Amino acid sequence: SVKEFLAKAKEDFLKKWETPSQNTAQLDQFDRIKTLGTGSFGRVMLVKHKESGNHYAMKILDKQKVVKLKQIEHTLNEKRILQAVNFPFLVKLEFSFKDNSNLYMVMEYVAGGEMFSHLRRIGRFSEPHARFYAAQIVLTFEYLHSLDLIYRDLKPENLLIDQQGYIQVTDFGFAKRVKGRTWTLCGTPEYLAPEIILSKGYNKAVDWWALGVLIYEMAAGYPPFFADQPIQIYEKIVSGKVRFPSHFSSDLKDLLRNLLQVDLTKRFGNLKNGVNDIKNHKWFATTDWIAIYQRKVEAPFIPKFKGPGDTSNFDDYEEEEIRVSINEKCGKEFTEF
Amino acid sequence: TTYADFIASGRTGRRASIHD
Ligand SMILES: Nc1ncnc2c1ncn2[C@@H]1O[C@H](COP(=O)(O)OP(=O)(O)O)[C@@H](O)[C@H]1O
Ligand code: NA
Ligand code: NA
């Protein structure tokens, strides 16, 4: 029974939402090894936890950069939510803390790398491969949405492949607990729903739009709407005209027309039957939703793993000193972190 | 081809978030 599972899941989440974890480690408990990845204003490092010997991924945020980009509320959101959630395809936050200069979120290290790099290297995924991933996102969104959470940053760069070949969603930077509508222009351009772009107000159905983009991109090897500049991308999205590769199944194309639907009254995920319109679509007919939840399905691809702190599934990045001022910065701003 | 046009475009690497 999904109903009962989700009901208890909400109880668990709310407890943590109401009284969040805080200050569960400190910087000198870790040796910093190397950068795994970056975003517009964050850096993630592979690190080794001294007393356990375990490896982790440490997301480092410079408080002054957070502020300068007006991302305070988003960042508080990110940590508040991440610390509260619990789902098989969501990355685990293991520790969090702050110091004079930075905020830290220490996650489980997902050593298989970004879906992005595999996708680009391989070129595209078969429909069964794409479907395997897609199913995970469907369930994750079912989970998140049920808690009044909107994710808002679905993309291959934010999806990690684990040692079993299953997905782990990372980057809750734009996650928000909202009942009804919100207005922030945030996300990644190729993935933005038309209603985000048009400053209309929008709800959780943007996540379902993004799922469409994701499936297309996984299946095609390129996104449904691309161009050299974000503004050209926005024009295309807003037109909503979509073309599909020759090799796309009929089933696939039908699903995507219903996900990349510019009309909210028509978009799958946002109808009377909700996620069930997606789950019961012919394209997912072969999907055993429970088996997926339980991680019992055989993964199409399992990343090569060589030891505990192997990073060979990740690109190399330019390193920089992790500076900590002797003066506390933005103390008030980040009190609850 | 669309593939070729994508590959030749400026947005084939990792994409950063936007937040206005
Ligand atoms: N749990 C982790 N395990 C391994 N690598 C990670 C993990 N989380 C993030 N990364 C890497 O770091 C990059 C940035 O993480 P992210 O959370 O998206 O920061 P940002 O908000 O700046 O984009 C990811 O795209 C991935 O390359
Ligand atoms: Na990111
Ligand atoms: Na982010």
mmCIF file of all heavy atoms in Angstrom, chain A residues 2-17 84-87 142-144 146-147 149 293:
data_model
loop_
_atom_site.group_PDB
_atom_site.id
_atom_site.type_symbol
_atom_site.label_atom_id
_atom_site.label_comp_id
_atom_site.label_asym_id
_atom_site.label_seq_id
_atom_site.Cartn_x
_atom_site.Cartn_y
_atom_site.Cartn_z
ATOM 1 N N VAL A 2 0.781 2.014 -1.049
ATOM 2 C CA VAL A 2 1.554 3.199 -1.101
ATOM 3 C C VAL A 2 1.093 4.175 -0.019
ATOM 4 O O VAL A 2 1.935 4.746 0.636
ATOM 5 C CB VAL A 2 1.452 3.807 -2.481
ATOM 6 C CG1 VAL A 2 2.699 4.579 -2.802
ATOM 7 C CG2 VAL A 2 1.204 2.712 -3.481
ATOM 8 N N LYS A 3 -0.226 4.279 0.132
ATOM 9 C CA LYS A 3 -0.868 5.180 1.063
ATOM 10 C C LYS A 3 -0.301 5.131 2.471
ATOM 11 O O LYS A 3 0.040 6.119 3.044
ATOM 12 C CB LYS A 3 -2.338 4.850 1.098
ATOM 13 C CG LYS A 3 -3.210 6.080 1.135
ATOM 14 C CD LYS A 3 -2.796 7.107 0.108
ATOM 15 C CE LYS A 3 -1.521 7.832 0.513
ATOM 16 N NZ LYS A 3 -1.254 9.023 -0.339
ATOM 17 N N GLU A 4 -0.171 3.934 2.993
ATOM 18 C CA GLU A 4 0.359 3.752 4.310
ATOM 19 C C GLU A 4 1.851 4.100 4.398
ATOM 20 O O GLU A 4 2.283 4.670 5.367
ATOM 21 C CB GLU A 4 0.130 2.330 4.738
ATOM 22 C CG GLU A 4 -1.198 2.108 5.398
ATOM 23 C CD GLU A 4 -1.755 0.720 5.178
ATOM 24 O OE1 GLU A 4 -1.135 -0.258 5.635
ATOM 25 O OE2 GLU A 4 -2.832 0.612 4.571
ATOM 26 N N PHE A 5 2.600 3.748 3.359
ATOM 27 C CA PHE A 5 4.047 3.998 3.320
ATOM 28 C C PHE A 5 4.361 5.478 3.320
ATOM 29 O O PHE A 5 5.179 5.931 4.035
ATOM 30 C CB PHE A 5 4.713 3.318 2.104
ATOM 31 C CG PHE A 5 6.050 3.876 1.780
ATOM 32 C CD1 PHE A 5 7.155 3.503 2.502
ATOM 33 C CD2 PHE A 5 6.190 4.825 0.805
ATOM 34 C CE1 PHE A 5 8.385 4.043 2.223
ATOM 35 C CE2 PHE A 5 7.412 5.364 0.509
ATOM 36 C CZ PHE A 5 8.509 4.983 1.231
ATOM 37 N N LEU A 6 3.642 6.175 2.472
ATOM 38 C CA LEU A 6 3.771 7.590 2.336
ATOM 39 C C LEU A 6 3.282 8.331 3.583
ATOM 40 O O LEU A 6 3.857 9.311 3.950
ATOM 41 C CB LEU A 6 3.044 8.094 1.109
ATOM 42 C CG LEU A 6 3.729 7.739 -0.196
ATOM 43 C CD1 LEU A 6 2.883 8.086 -1.391
ATOM 44 C CD2 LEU A 6 5.082 8.405 -0.271
ATOM 45 N N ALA A 7 2.234 7.829 4.215
ATOM 46 C CA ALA A 7 1.739 8.456 5.427
ATOM 47 C C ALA A 7 2.790 8.384 6.521
ATOM 48 O O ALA A 7 3.065 9.381 7.118
ATOM 49 C CB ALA A 7 0.442 7.838 5.880
ATOM 50 N N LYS A 8 3.373 7.221 6.746
ATOM 51 C CA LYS A 8 4.433 7.107 7.726
ATOM 52 C C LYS A 8 5.676 7.870 7.306
ATOM 53 O O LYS A 8 6.424 8.338 8.115
ATOM 54 C CB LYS A 8 4.836 5.675 7.993
ATOM 55 C CG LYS A 8 6.219 5.626 8.617
ATOM 56 C CD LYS A 8 6.841 4.251 8.645
ATOM 57 C CE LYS A 8 8.282 4.313 8.174
ATOM 58 N NZ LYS A 8 8.661 3.272 7.175
ATOM 59 N N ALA A 9 5.914 7.973 6.020
ATOM 60 C CA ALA A 9 7.057 8.704 5.550
ATOM 61 C C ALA A 9 6.888 10.184 5.873
ATOM 62 O O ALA A 9 7.813 10.852 6.263
ATOM 63 C CB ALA A 9 7.231 8.480 4.073
ATOM 64 N N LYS A 10 5.677 10.696 5.721
ATOM 65 C CA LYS A 10 5.412 12.086 6.065
ATOM 66 C C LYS A 10 5.621 12.352 7.565
ATOM 67 O O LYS A 10 6.134 13.356 7.940
ATOM 68 C CB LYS A 10 4.018 12.543 5.626
ATOM 69 C CG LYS A 10 3.857 14.046 5.576
ATOM 70 C CD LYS A 10 2.756 14.443 4.614
ATOM 71 C CE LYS A 10 2.979 15.823 4.017
ATOM 72 N NZ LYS A 10 1.958 16.259 3.033
ATOM 73 N N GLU A 11 5.262 11.405 8.396
ATOM 74 C CA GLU A 11 5.431 11.588 9.820
ATOM 75 C C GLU A 11 6.903 11.733 10.149
ATOM 76 O O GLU A 11 7.293 12.630 10.835
ATOM 77 C CB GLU A 11 4.825 10.416 10.583
ATOM 78 C CG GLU A 11 3.322 10.335 10.503
ATOM 79 C CD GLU A 11 2.773 8.981 10.943
ATOM 80 O OE1 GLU A 11 3.553 8.157 11.444
ATOM 81 O OE2 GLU A 11 1.553 8.739 10.817
ATOM 82 N N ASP A 12 7.706 10.822 9.617
ATOM 83 C CA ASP A 12 9.164 10.838 9.787
ATOM 84 C C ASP A 12 9.816 12.132 9.291
ATOM 85 O O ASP A 12 10.673 12.671 9.923
ATOM 86 C CB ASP A 12 9.787 9.668 9.030
ATOM 87 C CG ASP A 12 9.341 8.323 9.544
ATOM 88 O OD1 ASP A 12 8.810 8.248 10.655
ATOM 89 O OD2 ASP A 12 9.587 7.348 8.843
ATOM 90 N N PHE A 13 9.383 12.613 8.147
ATOM 91 C CA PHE A 13 9.927 13.803 7.562
ATOM 92 C C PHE A 13 9.591 15.019 8.399
ATOM 93 O O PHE A 13 10.413 15.849 8.638
ATOM 94 C CB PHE A 13 9.405 13.994 6.152
ATOM 95 C CG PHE A 13 9.650 15.354 5.585
ATOM 96 C CD1 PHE A 13 10.845 15.663 4.990
ATOM 97 C CD2 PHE A 13 8.683 16.350 5.645
ATOM 98 C CE1 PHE A 13 11.066 16.904 4.451
ATOM 99 C CE2 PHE A 13 8.915 17.599 5.130
ATOM 100 C CZ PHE A 13 10.108 17.889 4.520
ATOM 101 N N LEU A 14 8.340 15.097 8.807
ATOM 102 C CA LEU A 14 7.900 16.259 9.553
ATOM 103 C C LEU A 14 8.659 16.457 10.875
ATOM 104 O O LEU A 14 9.041 17.526 11.180
ATOM 105 C CB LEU A 14 6.396 16.238 9.720
ATOM 106 C CG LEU A 14 5.540 16.489 8.495
ATOM 107 C CD1 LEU A 14 4.076 16.386 8.857
ATOM 108 C CD2 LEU A 14 5.804 17.815 7.888
ATOM 109 N N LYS A 15 8.890 15.391 11.605
ATOM 110 C CA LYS A 15 9.685 15.437 12.802
ATOM 111 C C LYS A 15 11.041 16.105 12.558
ATOM 112 O O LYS A 15 11.462 16.949 13.260
ATOM 113 C CB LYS A 15 9.897 14.044 13.314
ATOM 114 C CG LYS A 15 8.650 13.351 13.777
ATOM 115 C CD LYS A 15 8.978 12.248 14.769
ATOM 116 C CE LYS A 15 7.742 11.711 15.478
ATOM 117 N NZ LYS A 15 7.539 10.251 15.281
ATOM 118 N N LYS A 16 11.704 15.701 11.492
ATOM 119 C CA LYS A 16 12.991 16.265 11.160
ATOM 120 C C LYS A 16 12.912 17.669 10.588
ATOM 121 O O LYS A 16 13.730 18.497 10.873
ATOM 122 C CB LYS A 16 13.738 15.317 10.240
ATOM 123 C CG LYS A 16 14.193 14.058 10.932
ATOM 124 C CD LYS A 16 14.749 13.028 9.975
ATOM 125 C CE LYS A 16 15.324 11.873 10.739
ATOM 126 N NZ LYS A 16 15.776 10.795 9.841
ATOM 127 N N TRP A 17 11.913 17.911 9.761
ATOM 128 C CA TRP A 17 11.605 19.248 9.297
ATOM 129 C C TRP A 17 11.435 20.219 10.461
ATOM 130 O O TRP A 17 11.978 21.303 10.444
ATOM 131 C CB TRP A 17 10.385 19.235 8.373
ATOM 132 C CG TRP A 17 9.866 20.576 7.901
ATOM 133 C CD1 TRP A 17 8.765 21.263 8.373
ATOM 134 C CD2 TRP A 17 10.386 21.418 6.839
ATOM 135 N NE1 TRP A 17 8.594 22.416 7.719
ATOM 136 C CE2 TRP A 17 9.519 22.576 6.784
ATOM 137 C CE3 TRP A 17 11.443 21.331 5.960
ATOM 138 C CZ2 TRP A 17 9.725 23.594 5.914
ATOM 139 C CZ3 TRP A 17 11.621 22.355 5.070
ATOM 140 C CH2 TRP A 17 10.789 23.468 5.050
ATOM 141 N N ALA A 84 16.111 15.966 6.249
ATOM 142 C CA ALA A 84 14.823 15.409 6.646
ATOM 143 C C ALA A 84 14.327 14.244 5.807
ATOM 144 O O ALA A 84 13.505 13.504 6.238
ATOM 145 C CB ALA A 84 13.788 16.494 6.620
ATOM 146 N N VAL A 85 14.830 14.122 4.594
ATOM 147 C CA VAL A 85 14.330 13.106 3.688
ATOM 148 C C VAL A 85 15.021 11.757 3.807
ATOM 149 O O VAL A 85 16.079 11.650 4.347
ATOM 150 C CB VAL A 85 14.326 13.582 2.235
ATOM 151 C CG1 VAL A 85 13.370 14.721 2.048
ATOM 152 C CG2 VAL A 85 15.716 13.983 1.815
ATOM 153 N N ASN A 86 14.375 10.737 3.280
ATOM 154 C CA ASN A 86 14.830 9.387 3.372
ATOM 155 C C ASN A 86 14.186 8.593 2.249
ATOM 156 O O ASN A 86 13.047 8.288 2.321
ATOM 157 C CB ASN A 86 14.441 8.775 4.708
ATOM 158 C CG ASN A 86 14.623 7.279 4.736
ATOM 159 O OD1 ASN A 86 13.812 6.553 5.293
ATOM 160 N ND2 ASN A 86 15.666 6.811 4.116
ATOM 161 N N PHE A 87 14.945 8.259 1.220
ATOM 162 C CA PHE A 87 14.411 7.494 0.100
ATOM 163 C C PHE A 87 15.580 6.840 -0.645
ATOM 164 O O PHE A 87 16.630 7.378 -0.734
ATOM 165 C CB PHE A 87 13.624 8.387 -0.832
ATOM 166 C CG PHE A 87 12.640 7.670 -1.714
ATOM 167 C CD1 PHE A 87 11.515 7.071 -1.185
ATOM 168 C CD2 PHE A 87 12.809 7.663 -3.096
ATOM 169 C CE1 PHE A 87 10.600 6.437 -2.004
ATOM 170 C CE2 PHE A 87 11.898 7.035 -3.899
ATOM 171 C CZ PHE A 87 10.798 6.409 -3.352
ATOM 172 N N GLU A 142 7.294 11.092 -6.711
ATOM 173 C CA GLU A 142 6.107 10.697 -5.999
ATOM 174 C C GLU A 142 6.375 10.926 -4.506
ATOM 175 O O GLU A 142 5.621 11.599 -3.854
ATOM 176 C CB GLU A 142 5.726 9.252 -6.291
ATOM 177 C CG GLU A 142 4.440 8.796 -5.631
ATOM 178 C CD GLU A 142 4.049 7.364 -5.949
ATOM 179 O OE1 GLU A 142 4.839 6.636 -6.517
ATOM 180 O OE2 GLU A 142 2.935 6.956 -5.620
ATOM 181 N N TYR A 143 7.472 10.390 -4.005
ATOM 182 C CA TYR A 143 7.866 10.641 -2.630
ATOM 183 C C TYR A 143 7.985 12.135 -2.273
ATOM 184 O O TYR A 143 7.346 12.589 -1.364
ATOM 185 C CB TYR A 143 9.140 9.891 -2.271
ATOM 186 C CG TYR A 143 9.788 10.248 -0.952
ATOM 187 C CD1 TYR A 143 9.401 9.640 0.211
ATOM 188 C CD2 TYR A 143 10.785 11.186 -0.881
ATOM 189 C CE1 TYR A 143 9.990 9.947 1.410
ATOM 190 C CE2 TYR A 143 11.381 11.493 0.317
ATOM 191 C CZ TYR A 143 10.960 10.878 1.464
ATOM 192 O OH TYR A 143 11.548 11.171 2.642
ATOM 193 N N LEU A 144 8.802 12.890 -2.975
ATOM 194 C CA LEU A 144 9.009 14.275 -2.645
ATOM 195 C C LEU A 144 7.724 15.113 -2.654
ATOM 196 O O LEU A 144 7.469 15.873 -1.751
ATOM 197 C CB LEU A 144 10.015 14.920 -3.580
ATOM 198 C CG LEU A 144 11.445 14.408 -3.464
ATOM 199 C CD1 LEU A 144 12.349 15.095 -4.465
ATOM 200 C CD2 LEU A 144 11.931 14.573 -2.045
ATOM 201 N N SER A 146 4.729 14.303 -2.222
ATOM 202 C CA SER A 146 3.833 13.903 -1.169
ATOM 203 C C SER A 146 4.138 14.596 0.155
ATOM 204 O O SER A 146 3.342 14.586 1.054
ATOM 205 C CB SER A 146 3.879 12.400 -0.995
ATOM 206 O OG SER A 146 4.892 12.000 -0.144
ATOM 207 N N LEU A 147 5.309 15.184 0.227
ATOM 208 C CA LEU A 147 5.778 15.920 1.383
ATOM 209 C C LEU A 147 5.681 17.400 1.150
ATOM 210 O O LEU A 147 6.206 18.150 1.885
ATOM 211 C CB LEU A 147 7.224 15.569 1.671
ATOM 212 C CG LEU A 147 7.654 14.145 1.915
ATOM 213 C CD1 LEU A 147 9.164 14.060 2.001
ATOM 214 C CD2 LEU A 147 7.009 13.531 3.130
ATOM 215 N N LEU A 149 7.121 18.906 -1.245
ATOM 216 C CA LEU A 149 8.402 19.353 -1.748
ATOM 217 C C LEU A 149 8.440 19.441 -3.247
ATOM 218 O O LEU A 149 8.009 18.554 -3.895
ATOM 219 C CB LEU A 149 9.498 18.409 -1.276
ATOM 220 C CG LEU A 149 9.687 18.204 0.216
ATOM 221 C CD1 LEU A 149 10.650 17.076 0.561
ATOM 222 C CD2 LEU A 149 10.026 19.531 0.860
ATOM 223 N N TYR A 293 11.606 -0.018 -6.512
ATOM 224 C CA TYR A 293 11.709 0.547 -5.188
ATOM 225 C C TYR A 293 12.670 -0.269 -4.362
ATOM 226 O O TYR A 293 13.508 0.278 -3.704
ATOM 227 C CB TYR A 293 10.355 0.629 -4.489
ATOM 228 C CG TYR A 293 10.480 1.027 -3.054
ATOM 229 C CD1 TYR A 293 10.758 2.311 -2.687
ATOM 230 C CD2 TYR A 293 10.365 0.103 -2.074
ATOM 231 C CE1 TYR A 293 10.907 2.657 -1.387
ATOM 232 C CE2 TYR A 293 10.482 0.443 -0.758
ATOM 233 C CZ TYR A 293 10.758 1.704 -0.434
ATOM 234 O OH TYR A 293 10.897 1.994 0.858
#
